[PDB]
Amino acid sequence: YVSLADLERAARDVLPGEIFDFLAGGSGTEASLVANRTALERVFVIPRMLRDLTDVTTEIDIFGRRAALPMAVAPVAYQRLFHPEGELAVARAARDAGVPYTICTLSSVSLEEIAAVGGRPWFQLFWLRDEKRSLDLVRRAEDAGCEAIVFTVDVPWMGRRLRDMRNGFALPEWVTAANFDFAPATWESVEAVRAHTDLPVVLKGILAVEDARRAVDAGAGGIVVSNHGGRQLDGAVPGIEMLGEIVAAVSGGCEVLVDGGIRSGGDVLKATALGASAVLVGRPVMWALAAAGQDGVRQLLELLAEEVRDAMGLAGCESVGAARRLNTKLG
Amino acid sequence: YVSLADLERAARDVLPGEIFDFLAGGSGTEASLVANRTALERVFVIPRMLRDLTDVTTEIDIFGRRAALPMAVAPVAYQRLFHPEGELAVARAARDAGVPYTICTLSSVSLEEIAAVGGRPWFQLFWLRDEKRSLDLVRRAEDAGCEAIVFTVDVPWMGRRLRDMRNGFALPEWVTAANFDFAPATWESVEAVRAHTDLPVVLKGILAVEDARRAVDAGAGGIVVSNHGGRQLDGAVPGIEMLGEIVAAVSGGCEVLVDGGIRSGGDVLKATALGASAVLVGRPVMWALAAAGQDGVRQLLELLAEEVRDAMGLAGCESVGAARRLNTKLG
Amino acid sequence: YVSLADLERAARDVLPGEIFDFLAGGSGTEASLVANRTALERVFVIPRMLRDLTDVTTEIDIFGRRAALPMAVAPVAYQRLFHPEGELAVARAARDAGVPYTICTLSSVSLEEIAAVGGRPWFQLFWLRDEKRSLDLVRRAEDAGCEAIVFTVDVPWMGRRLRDMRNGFALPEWVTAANFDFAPATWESVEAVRAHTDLPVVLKGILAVEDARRAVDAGAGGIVVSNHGGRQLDGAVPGIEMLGEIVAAVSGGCEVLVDGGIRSGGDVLKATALGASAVLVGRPVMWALAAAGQDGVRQLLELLAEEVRDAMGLAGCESVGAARRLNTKLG
Amino acid sequence: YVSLADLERAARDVLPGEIFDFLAGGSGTEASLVANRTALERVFVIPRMLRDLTDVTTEIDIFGRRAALPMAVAPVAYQRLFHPEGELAVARAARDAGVPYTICTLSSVSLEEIAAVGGRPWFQLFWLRDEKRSLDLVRRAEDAGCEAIVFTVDVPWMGRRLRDMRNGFALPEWVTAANFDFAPATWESVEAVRAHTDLPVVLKGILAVEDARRAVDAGAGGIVVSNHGGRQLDGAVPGIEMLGEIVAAVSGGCEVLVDGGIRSGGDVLKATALGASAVLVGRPVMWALAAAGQDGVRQLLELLAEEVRDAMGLAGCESVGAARRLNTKLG
Numbered sequence A, B, C, D: 001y002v003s004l005a006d007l008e009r010a011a012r013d014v015l016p017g018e019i020f021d022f023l024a025g026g027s028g029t030e031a032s033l034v035a036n037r038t039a040l041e042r043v044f045v046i047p048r049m050l051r052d053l054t055d056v057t058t059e060i061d062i063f064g065r066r067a068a069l070p071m072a073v074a075p076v077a078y079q080r081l082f083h084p085e086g087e088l089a090v091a092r093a094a095r096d097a098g099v100p101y102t103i104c105t106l107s108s109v110s111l112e113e114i115a116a117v118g119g120r121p122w123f124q125l126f127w128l129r130d131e132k133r134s135l136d137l138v139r140r141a142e143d144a145g146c147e148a149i150v151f152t153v154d155v156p157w158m159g160r161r162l163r164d165m166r167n168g169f170a171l172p173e174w175v176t177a178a179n180f181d182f183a184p185a186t187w188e189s190v191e192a193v194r195a196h197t198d199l200p201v202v203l204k205g206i207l208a209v210e211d212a213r214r215a216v217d218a219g220a221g222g223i224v225v226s227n228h229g230g231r232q233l234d235g236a237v238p239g240i241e242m243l244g245e246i247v248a249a250v251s252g253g254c255e256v257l258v259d260g261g262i263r264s265g266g267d268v269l270k271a272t273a274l275g276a277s278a279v280l281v282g283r284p285v286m287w288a289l290a291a292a293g294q295d296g297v298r299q300l301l302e303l304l305a306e307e308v309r310d311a312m313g314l315a316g317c318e319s320v321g322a323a324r325r326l327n328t329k330l331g
């Protein structure tokens, strides 16, 4: 595998069609899904030359911990859909690569088992039905050693995924929500979470500038600027198109991550140059999982690591901070 | 049917080619027809998160009455072309959905029969040959219980529809202008109508900002920002491209509606976010009529209702007014 | 024929390939040729409604004479290439339509014969080898009753037409330059012409704003904002893209015409709305000539006349002057 | 051959696939490779008319010497890959055309043999492993009569060329680095070179404005605004998109060249109009070499010479300086 696109074809071959579609699809006409890629493709970097590259490092510090790359594995529900080892395969590869892994509320292996793998697990929260259970999930995650709560804020309910509707797709009987035996979140829900954990709370799915500033005011330790991979509002702006304005508005008040369509180290560089602290990567991690299990994800993460270092140095950046100071031009 | 596009294919199968073309076509090279869709596709919404969605409502008040959605059925002449029950099937489904139905001057069932169906009928006016007959049609409509006069102002004569010319298309002998046994409108014609009814007069086919302001000055209760579905001037700007500027110029002085290419609840949301009070929908209603009669239109209107509610809540809007305060970004 | 595009197909059928290519082609990679159409397609008109259309007229006064449309037939060399009656067929149809016809320096029928047809002939000048012969051609034209000298200023030499090179195209022995038994023009050449005729001198092939202003200063009675149909500099900006800026810069000091890709009455309207006094039309006139001789050109000119009137009234313009006051929007 | 594109097809026929790919390819997804052409295609020139063209000259003075065209042959490593005579064939044709030829550090014929051909050789430098050897290469070049040192500054290491990886491409045993029996460059390396030669030092691969100004401050005699033909950072902005801003920032302090996708005399004109002193041309020279050896390159250079003169005069420019004062418009 010499690009992330080799892995997509290999995943399409092995997965059942309806599962491939569950993974690949977006909501509505898939406008936002396609726009995530379009938007990245319009961005060109203006590289710097003749800088010292004797110690190029891709490491960052985030939410109290060193990460090997400015990247984390995005939350993706039900990973046993893609491979029998599911979340454990992905979490092991992430641990070994030094990349944070986001454990899902709807994980197909329990959060405690996943966290036992080690590494830098984060925990993604879907707000439940009741405040007390939501907060129980948060406490479980914190007790298990998760280092951040990734509160998903863009899913008051799920988007209408027409591929799944047409396929009549439903979870196989062999995949379950292993954390169990839901409701719209509000700012009051954010406060309830913030009051009940000492972990950084990261709001995932912020697109409006006013919401980014309120997230800081609310005591968030980060946000993820995201349209949920084009799976929520069809017609929502891509995160990458809001990122620059949002980074300027928070003015260092929280970490600002982005996701949506990141498919190479050059894409990571683009996101960094627009001001992102780090990115999330979703679908490609699942392609590598589907294609080759743990070793598949490990290979993906090594290819991304090499592509990020490559891109940084070709752009004259010895550190991620320097990459953030690069300028861009739209094509 | 899980999108409006399923219905188009079903209509293409059942209708005779030349009738499908009458419906689908525009004037000239169809530039304005295509641009209506292009323009909507360029618009992205910036959704808001974490707002109270406990009582999301799609209702609006317009021209004195509650409507269930910010939408009305556009005037489309000769609906017996598409189904034997014609306008009565459409008007019944609209009534049952709580959406206003626009009765045409060139309806293939008489305006009085259509209005007898009940619901919230509006009446569209083509200016006749003489002031007295025009005003008779208006009086008939008002006497029959129509709640607004939709004066079409963009048809001093008809556009050159090359599909129809090539097809040598002509009304079958079995469809007639059931309101009977025409001339360019002017501002003087608007005043004659305004002076002779107590109903709100809505000017349909306004694109210039100066014309929107004059419509307010003239005592219009609304306008429809529209290029007549690309069927009049070929090269006329899409309404959606003028809407924001026109909403700012009238500064609350009349309702501002838009039409042209609205094909989903996400499109409704876009129009709302650009400042529209409500939209009209034309061709898709006729596709549903052609495909499945009354029940077909009912299904379409239920799908739109669900898509509008979906979109609103995913964008953090509990009401249409809140949707109007959303910001947009062009792609 | 219900569009100008029907005529192109009919011309492609009858003409020998290499002659069709001579007609259709441009210089280089044909970038400027294609851009003429692209540019027109980006322009949308903002129509006005509810104006008096009781006496819509397409007439204009130009260079001392009434014309039936804001349009003239562009100079196109060697029209016997396309039909045996060549320039006489075209000039007769133009006369009968009330449109000025531009007689070429390289006409395949003598300028005196063409002018004998009557109508409103103009004469296009290519600068010769010597000042005295150039001026003889001008005197011949004036003596024959031509009403304007269209001095071509964008051909210091001919563009590299790769279709013709590949075809090894050469004038058949049966077509000759009937005005005979060339050199780069300069501003000094313009003055020599201006000093030797009382006719309005029109500089054809102006694209820079500074050249438009100098043309006024030089005593030109008009200019044609033009990239020579994409046949001269490959990469020259389309005239339509310079027109607005040039109209503002001359501020009524001379007539400002445009050409390049005008293929409908809607295109005429666009050019007018951008500020053109009139347009030239080239290739479509030759398609109609090739397809059906005199009667073919007559049909084209009647179709354009109807399309121009149609477009004007749909846009609320009772006169060409009103069309010039329309606003536009780029798509 | 009547365009540069005829030569590409002829090269594709004769070269082995993997060598054609080595030549044609870029890094990553080839975004920057494609963008070099896109960017040129967006540029339109605004030509001037009616200027004196009695003595049109394409000559320029650069780095102390007259060149016949505002163009040089770009450095391209290992030219014996494309033809058995390699660099000598290219250098002979360049000499005979009066165009500077850039001898590569990785030339497949020794720099001394190439320079013995005569003409205006320049020498391109890749920074070595040690300062003393780098400087030896520079001294060799100067001793051999090279007239400028083209220091490549955009290759701290090589880009990831996926075509070559997929092809498993490797230098045949019959091609060697004939100058021998590498390390990231820095500004300190530039100074070491500048201190050790009296030749103008030209930094090739500058894209940021701040780097252009520092190059002047560093005592460079020129720069080449370049993304290395899309072979280094995938996502690097095209040089042509930075050129105008960089020319304004150096304000005459050094020569500013550009490369990337120059494929015609019209493209040369575009680069000149954006402010370039001269261009480099890479891939097309290798196509002509592959197709027809020395005589192939000679034919290419004659075709470019004629296309540059053609374009200049059609645009009203009697000299390259006048071409630099042309304005442009983006399409």
Ligand SMILES: Cc1cc2nc3c(=O)[nH]c(=O)nc-3n(C[C@H](O)[C@H](O)[C@H](O)COP(=O)(O)O)c2cc1C
Pocket (backbone or CB within 6 Å): A022, A023, A024, A036, A074, A075, A076, A077, A104, A105, A106, A124, A152, A204, A226, A227, A228, A229, A231, A259, A260, A261, A262, A280, A281, A282, A283, A284
């Ligand atoms: C199959 C699938 C399941 C997902 N499940 C979740 C989830 O449970 N929670 C969440 O916050 N995001 C979820 N996401 C969204 C991802 O976290 C991420 O925002 C999106 O996939 C990012 O884009 P990418 O896949 O283009 O890299 C899911 C995405 C996919 C494709």
Ligand SMILES: Cc1cc2nc3c(=O)[nH]c(=O)nc-3n(C[C@H](O)[C@H](O)[C@H](O)COP(=O)(O)O)c2cc1C
Pocket (backbone or CB within 6 Å): B022, B023, B024, B036, B074, B075, B076, B077, B104, B105, B106, B124, B152, B204, B226, B227, B228, B229, B231, B259, B260, B261, B262, B280, B281, B282, B283, B284
């Ligand atoms: C077949 C057909 C007939 C129409 N008849 C009328 C009419 O009688 N009066 C009118 O004002 N608009 C008429 N319209 C225009 C519609 O009211 C509406 O402006 C246009 O169709 C809106 O766009 P949409 O079809 O893209 O939703 C007609 C449209 C179509 C397609």
Ligand SMILES: Cc1cc2nc3c(=O)[nH]c(=O)nc-3n(C[C@H](O)[C@H](O)[C@H](O)COP(=O)(O)O)c2cc1C
Pocket (backbone or CB within 6 Å): C022, C023, C024, C036, C074, C075, C076, C077, C104, C105, C106, C124, C152, C204, C226, C227, C228, C229, C231, C259, C260, C261, C262, C280, C281, C282, C283, C284
């Ligand atoms: C076959 C052909 C021959 C032409 N000959 C001349 C000429 O002799 N003089 C001139 O000024 N323009 C000449 N032109 C350019 C036209 O006058 C006009 O600028 C160009 O064709 C306008 O565009 P259109 O063909 O797109 O309508 C010629 C154009 C064509 C296609």
Ligand SMILES: Cc1cc2nc3c(=O)[nH]c(=O)nc-3n(C[C@H](O)[C@H](O)[C@H](O)COP(=O)(O)O)c2cc1C
Pocket (backbone or CB within 6 Å): D022, D023, D024, D036, D074, D075, D076, D077, D104, D105, D106, D124, D152, D204, D226, D227, D228, D229, D231, D259, D260, D261, D262, D280, D281, D282, D283, D284
């Ligand atoms: C096969 C190949 C080899 C190259 N080798 C070198 C090199 O040794 N040094 C260098 O500075 N640039 C090198 N370049 C880049 C060229 O100098 C030039 O920047 C690029 O090819 C310019 O674009 P063009 O090929 O689009 O005209 C090479 C380019 C190609 C295609």
Ligand SMILES: O=C(O)[C@@H](O)Cc1ccccc1
Pocket (backbone or CB within 6 Å): A077, A078, A106, A228, A231
């Ligand atoms: O995009 C998302 O967040 C959802 O698709 C995750 C999910 C999948 C399946 C069932 C429930 C939830």
Ligand SMILES: O=C(O)[C@@H](O)Cc1ccccc1
Pocket (backbone or CB within 6 Å): A039, A040, A042, A043, A240, A241, A242, A244, A330
């Ligand atoms: O308005 C801005 O500043 C960004 O939306 C521009 C942008 C477009 C596409 C991708 C990234 C950024």
Ligand SMILES: O=C(O)[C@@H](O)Cc1ccccc1
Pocket (backbone or CB within 6 Å): B077, B078, B106, B228, B231
């Ligand atoms: O777009 C419109 O408004 C017309 O097509 C309506 C109409 C149809 C048929 C006959 C007359 C009128």
Ligand SMILES: O=C(O)[C@@H](O)Cc1ccccc1
Pocket (backbone or CB within 6 Å): B039, B040, B042, B043, B240, B241, B242, B244, B330
């Ligand atoms: O000028 C403006 O402000 C709008 O025309 C922009 C727009 C384009 C496309 C769609 C909607 C809006």
Ligand SMILES: O=C(O)[C@@H](O)Cc1ccccc1
Pocket (backbone or CB within 6 Å): C077, C078, C106, C228, C231
């Ligand atoms: O575009 C033009 O103006 C030329 O093609 C006219 C011409 C044709 C043939 C020979 C000479 C001149």
Ligand SMILES: O=C(O)[C@@H](O)Cc1ccccc1
Pocket (backbone or CB within 6 Å): C039, C040, C042, C043, C240, C241, C242, C244, C330
């Ligand atoms: O800069 C301007 O104002 C015109 O070039 C814009 C334009 C583009 C395309 C067509 C016409 C006009």
Ligand SMILES: O=C(O)[C@@H](O)Cc1ccccc1
Pocket (backbone or CB within 6 Å): D077, D078, D106, D228, D231
């Ligand atoms: O683009 C470049 O500069 C390299 O491809 C040149 C090179 C080719 C082969 C081996 C080493 C270096």
Ligand SMILES: O=C(O)[C@@H](O)Cc1ccccc1
Pocket (backbone or CB within 6 Å): D039, D040, D042, D043, D240, D241, D242, D244, D330
């Ligand atoms: O910003 C500018 O001024 C140039 O990037 C514009 C440009 C685009 C494409 C080609 C050349 C120039």
